[PDB]
Design an enzyme around this catalytic site. Structure first.
Site, PDB file in Angstrom:
ATOM      1  CB  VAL A   1      18.019 -51.196 -40.138  1.00 47.86           C
ATOM      2  CG1 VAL A   1      17.108 -52.394 -40.166  1.00 47.86           C
ATOM      3  CG2 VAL A   1      17.949 -50.486 -38.785  1.00 47.86           C
TER       4      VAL A   1
ATOM      5  CG  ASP B   1      15.396 -38.818 -35.420  1.00 51.15           C
ATOM      6  OD1 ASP B   1      15.230 -37.765 -36.068  1.00 51.15           O
ATOM      7  OD2 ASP B   1      16.121 -39.750 -35.816  1.00 51.15           O
TER       8      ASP B   1
ATOM      9  N   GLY C   1      28.319 -52.573 -45.151  1.00 48.18           N
ATOM     10  CA  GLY C   1      28.167 -51.469 -46.071  1.00 48.18           C
ATOM     11  C   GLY C   1      27.476 -50.235 -45.540  1.00 48.18           C
ATOM     12  N   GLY C   2      27.232 -50.130 -44.234  1.00 45.95           N
ATOM     13  CA  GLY C   2      26.460 -49.028 -43.706  1.00 45.95           C
ATOM     14  C   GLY C   2      27.091 -48.367 -42.507  1.00 45.95           C
TER      15      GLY C   2
HETATM   16  C1  LIG Z   1      12.907 -50.107 -44.746  1.00 46.74           C
HETATM   17  O1  LIG Z   1      13.333 -50.429 -43.420  1.00 46.74           O
HETATM   18  C2  LIG Z   1      12.530 -51.357 -42.820  1.00 46.74           C
HETATM   19  N1  LIG Z   1      11.537 -51.992 -43.452  1.00 46.74           N
HETATM   20  N2  LIG Z   1      10.959 -52.765 -42.647  1.00 46.74           N
HETATM   21  C3  LIG Z   1      11.554 -52.651 -41.456  1.00 46.74           C
HETATM   22  N3  LIG Z   1      11.299 -53.267 -40.300  1.00 46.74           N
HETATM   23  C4  LIG Z   1      12.071 -52.991 -39.188  1.00 46.74           C
HETATM   24  C5  LIG Z   1      13.101 -52.052 -39.291  1.00 46.74           C
HETATM   25  C6  LIG Z   1      13.842 -51.829 -38.042  1.00 46.74           C
HETATM   26  C7  LIG Z   1      14.411 -51.685 -37.009  1.00 46.74           C
HETATM   27  C8  LIG Z   1      15.117 -51.501 -35.731  1.00 46.74           C
HETATM   28  C9  LIG Z   1      16.188 -52.311 -35.367  1.00 46.74           C
HETATM   29  F1  LIG Z   1      16.598 -53.320 -36.204  1.00 46.74           F
HETATM   30  C10 LIG Z   1      16.831 -52.109 -34.153  1.00 46.74           C
HETATM   31  C11 LIG Z   1      16.415 -51.080 -33.295  1.00 46.74           C
HETATM   32  C12 LIG Z   1      15.352 -50.262 -33.666  1.00 46.74           C
HETATM   33  N4  LIG Z   1      14.858 -49.233 -32.950  1.00 46.74           N
HETATM   34  S1  LIG Z   1      15.459 -48.894 -31.486  1.00 46.74           S
HETATM   35  O2  LIG Z   1      16.960 -48.753 -31.531  1.00 46.74           O
HETATM   36  O3  LIG Z   1      14.856 -47.582 -31.013  1.00 46.74           O
HETATM   37  C13 LIG Z   1      14.985 -50.107 -30.275  1.00 46.74           C
HETATM   38  C14 LIG Z   1      13.744 -50.715 -30.347  1.00 46.74           C
HETATM   39  C15 LIG Z   1      13.342 -51.649 -29.395  1.00 46.74           C
HETATM   40  C16 LIG Z   1      14.171 -51.984 -28.335  1.00 46.74           C
HETATM   41  C17 LIG Z   1      15.412 -51.361 -28.257  1.00 46.74           C
HETATM   42 BR1  LIG Z   1      16.559 -51.768 -26.848  1.00 46.74          BR
HETATM   43  C18 LIG Z   1      15.812 -50.428 -29.208  1.00 46.74           C
HETATM   44  C19 LIG Z   1      14.719 -50.478 -34.879  1.00 46.74           C
HETATM   45  F2  LIG Z   1      13.782 -49.744 -35.201  1.00 46.74           F
HETATM   46  C20 LIG Z   1      13.330 -51.432 -40.515  1.00 46.74           C
HETATM   47  C21 LIG Z   1      12.558 -51.763 -41.559  1.00 46.74           C
END
Ligand SMILES: COc1n[nH]c2ncc(C#Cc3c(F)ccc(NS(=O)(=O)c4cccc(Br)c4)c3F)cc12
Length: 291
Positions: free
Chosen positions: A23, A126, A17-18
């Site tokens: 995430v 960002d 759905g996204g």
């Molecule tokens: C309301 O959303 C959330 N509430 N609580 C949460 N906790 C964690 C997340 C998340 C995430 C996430 C993810 F699932 C994948 C990647 C990333 N960030 S990233 O793409 O910059 C990244 C981070 C670490 C290693 C690598 Br390779 C890539 C992320 F930040 C989102 C939430």
């Protein structure tokens, strides 16, 4: 670069759905861990280099899903949601100066790690309140720090992000680590005022004001001078005059030794009914000037 099977994940919301970059909260079944899963178009092997970043104020990498067409990055899940959602809820009424200081230090410490302590230098580009999340014990965790390098398609809308974007980023100009200092300044302002930056303004309008007119978010007259000066240093048009995150942490430590600041800041924080009109007046002025 631990690989996680798509079949080893229980998704809590539907993952179809996204948009890319979405995430999803999920259970990593074989490890009995709650996780976040970011949906990607594809994953570069080279993203391996970020898999070794680890710090208490950045989201923790767990693995990658590598089963076309399903690609994603799996991380820890911070139980209490995003900073943005917290701030713009009535729950943020519980924040006092000690709370803001702790959270401002959390974000500054994660960014200092990314800029100066990590095996690879990471400039986020960002940073914003929607990209910081709150773990179960209140520790803040920076997310999406690899997007600008490895999955730019997730980031771009862009209009939504203009309140947090440094002028040099808006103009595609030479960019240094202090583009993140500017964004952090905005996140601090959000914590202080608990308002949406430039609420209701068109993103192109924001970018124009910020870049051509040196417009910045309204700092209420009753904001403590120490916070106001910190915001002004983060928001300098000349990025070389902005503080590093090491300098910001030093300032926060000096502010935490100011015995006059808890009373001044808590009085300011709980006085939102009085100063909220100063922010709304600027917004009315900016909206009318566009007309
Ligand atoms: C309301 O959303 C959330 N509430 N609580 C949460 N906790 C964690 C997340 C998340 C995430 C996430 C993810 F699932 C994948 C990647 C990333 N960030 S990233 O793409 O910059 C990244 C981070 C670490 C290693 C690598 Br390779 C890539 C992320 F930040 C989102 C939430």
């Amino acid at each position: 670069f631990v690989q996680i099977k798509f079949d080893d994940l229980q998704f809590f919301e539907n993952c179809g759905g996204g948009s890319f970059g979405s995430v999803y909260r999920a259970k990593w079944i074989s490890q009995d861990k709650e996780v976040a899963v970011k949906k990607l178009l594809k994953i570069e092997k080279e993203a391996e280099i970020l898999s070794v970043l680890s710090h208490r104020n950045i989201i923790q990498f767990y693995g990658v899903i590598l089963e076309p067409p399903n690609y994603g990055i799996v991380t820890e899940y911070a139980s209490l949601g995003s900073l943005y959602d917290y701030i713009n809820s009535n729950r943020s009424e519980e924040m006092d100066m000690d709370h803001i200081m702790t959270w401002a230090t959390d974000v500054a410490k994660g960014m200092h790690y990314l800029h100066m302590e990590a095996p690879v230098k990471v400039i986020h580009r960002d940073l914003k309140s929607r990209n910081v999340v709150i773990a179960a014990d209140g520790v803040l965790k920076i997310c999406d720090f690899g997007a600008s390098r490895f999955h730019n398609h997730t980031t771009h809308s862009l209009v939504g992000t203009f309140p947090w974007m440094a002028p040099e980023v808006i103009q595609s100009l030479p960019v240094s680590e202090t583009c993140d200092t500017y964004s952090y300044g905005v996140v601090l302002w959000e914590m202080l005022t608990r308002e949406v930056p430039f609420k209701g303004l068109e993103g192109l309008q924001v970018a124009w004001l910020v870049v051509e007119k040196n417009e910045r978010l309204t700092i209420p007259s009753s904001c403590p001078r120490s916070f106001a000066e910190l915001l002004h240093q983060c928001w300098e048009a000349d990025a070389k005059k902005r503080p590093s995150f090491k300098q910001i942490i030093s300032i926060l430590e000096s502010m935490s030794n100011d015995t006059s600041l808890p009373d001044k800041c808590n009085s300011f924080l709980h006085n939102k009914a009085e100063w909220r009109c100063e922010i709304e007046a600027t917004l009315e002025r900016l909206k009318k000037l566009e007309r």
